[PDB]
């Protein structure tokens with residue numbers, strides 16, 4: 001649908017500050033200045049490094065993604081460069097969030113984030129869409145209780161490879177499927193449960209396919225019980241059809257969230273509950289009016 005993607009003129013918005021850059025482009029905090037208005041509305045703008053018909057075709061798919069746990073493409077400006085406009089997320093990405101909060105995050109948040117990421121990826125799988133670059137850096141925090149997958153469509157649009165997130169078949173043959181996204185999901189879960197450790201830290205990207213072929217995998221995070229680590233390891237089976245399905249991961253992590261201290265061991269966890277209804281309501285009113293499923297609370 002034409003209606004989902006806004007074509008912006010360069011005069012309608014301005015880049016203000018670089019937020020960073022990765023494999024496909026550079027992101028800026030920007031301002032949208034709607035013509036004839038005096039308001040300045042914060043947005044994120046991603047300008048791609050390095051056709052228009054093909055670009056717009058993929059942009060319309062990206063703009064069609066409508067799920068509480070996946071970011072939608074809102075607008076595009078095609079000039080000499082491709083610029084992608086999306087909602088700005090002040091909390092930033094979940095990788096930085098778990099690093100910065102390494103001592104104040106409880107099991108309920110971690111297990112619910114795993115549910116939310118699996119729900120967003122399952123939505124993509126149901127639409128027959130493959131992400132190709134899932135990682136904790138590509139999950140954005142809308143509120144601490146609500147996360148969203150970002151950068152859907154970018155890898156396809158432009159495809160340093162994120163070797164350390166990639167299924168072995170993607171590394172060796174650039175094969176990407178829902179089940180290779182499941183491998184990346186397992187790495188993403190490992191990043192969360194380690195509070196943002198670097199996977200395979202110190203090992204050169206060029207050594208990784210050899211390590212995987214020998215059967216070596218990312219280590220058990222100290223907070224994870226064996227059932228949680230077995231899920232991660234199942235995501236990294238060489239046989240892609242032996243890996244879990246995202247819909248299975250929604251079920252498993254939701255079950256775990258109903259008994260969180262049975263599945264993760266975190267110092268001080270009893271002091272780290274989900275927000276009260278009062279605090280949740282206040283967050284939603286200021287930052288998060290969109291429809292979403294209830295978070296999974298503990299039975300006890």
Ligand SMILES: Nc1ncnc2c1ncn2[C@@H]1O[C@H](COP(=O)(O)OP(=O)(O)NP(=O)(O)O)[C@@H](O)[C@H]1O
Nearest residue numbers: 019020021022023024025027044087088089093137
């Ligand atoms: N909508 C957004 N709101 C706020 N920060 C954002 C948004 N989108 C991206 N960022 C941040 O902008 C920076 C650049 O992102 P990006 O160019 O996608 O690199 P990356 O996520 O680190 N790696 P990759 O996506 O794998 O290429 C990172 O710090 C992102 O977290």
Ligand SMILES: [Mg+2]
Nearest residue numbers: 022137138151
């Ligand atoms: Mg990114």
